[PDB]
Paper text:
While [name] features an NAD+-dependent catalytic mechanism and belongs to class III HDACs, also referred to as sirtuins, [name] is a Zn2+-dependent lysine deacylase and has been classified as a class IIb HDAC. Although both deacylases are classified as histone deacetylases, they share acetylated α-tubulin (α-tubulin K40ac) as their major substrate and are hence frequently referred to as tubulin deacetylases.
As the crystal structures of human and zebrafish CD2 enzymes are essentially identical, the zebrafish [name] CD2 (henceforth simply “[name]”) serves as a more readily studied surrogate of the human enzyme. The hydroxamate N–O– group coordinates to the catalytic Zn2+ ion with a Zn2+–O separation of 2.0 Å. The hydroxamate C=O group accepts a hydrogen bond from the Zn2+-bound water molecule, which also forms hydrogen bonds with the imidazole side chains of H573 and H574. Additionally, the phenolic hydroxyl group of Y745 forms poorly oriented hydrogen bonds with the hydroxamate C=O and NH groups. The phenyl subunit of 55 is sandwiched between F583 and F643, making staggered π-stacking interactions. The carbonyl of the inhibitor capping group accepts a hydrogen bond from a nearby water molecule and is positioned 3.6 Å away from a molecule of ethylene glycol. The acetamide NH group of the inhibitor capping group is 3.7 Å from the side chain of S531 and the acetamide methyl group is oriented toward solvent, although electron density coverage is poor in this region of the electron density map.
Numbering used by the authors: 442 to 798
The structure:
Amino acid sequence: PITGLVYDQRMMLHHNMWDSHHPELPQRISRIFSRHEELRLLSRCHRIPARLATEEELALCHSSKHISIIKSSEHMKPRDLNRLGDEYNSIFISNESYTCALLAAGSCFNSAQAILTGQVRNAVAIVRPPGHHAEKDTACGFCFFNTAALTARYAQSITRESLRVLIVDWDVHHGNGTQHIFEEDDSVLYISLHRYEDGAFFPNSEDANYDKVGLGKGRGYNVNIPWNGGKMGDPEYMAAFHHLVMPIAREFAPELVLVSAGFDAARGDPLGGFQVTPEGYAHLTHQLMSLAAGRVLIILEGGYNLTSISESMSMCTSMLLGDSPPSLDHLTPLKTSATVSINNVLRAHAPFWSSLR
Ligand SMILES: CC(=O)NCc1ccc(C(=O)NO)cc1
Ligand SMILES: [K+]
Ligand SMILES: [K+]
Ligand SMILES: [Zn+2]
């Protein structure tokens, strides 16, 4: 029972040259890596090497136009980097951004291959920039290519096209790119939990609402769990996993589990405003390990409080390594609004998932 880990400091080169304090900091991944060292987690892992994704692997999910444009930014002067970045919603670009997005995706491909060939049971990928807001034809929300989506398609390309992949997105934002890439696809189940507030939270679209259940053959295979009405924490996330995430996942029976693991729902993050604890994330990980014979890959997305993301992702790697789940703090009763959300998702997905109660 071996846990893999992939990290490469070259992904720190991506940076905002007009705001050195932009929250999507190079030091996100370095701080996480150091905490793994300090807690003696890194030494217990098998170290998976990082690599560049190829242009053909990007074509698994992204259009040739979008690859061509981001690729061209490697040679742009700062004035053009600024112009191009402003053509997207919430994007900054440097000369290293294209290469770092390649490394993030390729690092995850290597970890998926390591899991699928039996070299490791599960794995953690400490990567940046994130991916789950990137769509087929455009970058968005600090994301250039959709790393989690590309990894699912990569996993299928090296096994069989019908490989059942579950993607759990517990980043506090809706992974619009991941939903849309797989919207008509019943081979990849997308489950996202996210702050919604009636469509006023980034990325500010009703695409994130519970009633978007998929299209065509993929009806039932897109599960949005939207939060309305202020701060949520461990009790709401534990209830959502108990009533929705784990019953649907068990009925889907994935062969590989990818976590789009933002840590911006963590206590202390200003961009999320939630208070999921490191012990909370440990329990979420431990539940997911009961699926897919333990084939779980945890992929960093967002998460912007440096101390919070370091403690929270370390807690996840500790669970993958087999440590006992930590004792949870007091679980306050479910906020009425959280009950409403879980009930809305249950009602919307009752047709597709016979397990639901
Ligand atoms: C200031 C602001 O709200 N900018 C928009 C925005 C915010 C967060 C993300 C993200 O990726 N979070 O994990 C992306 C875009
Ligand atoms: K999410
Ligand atoms: K789907
Ligand atoms: Zn986020």
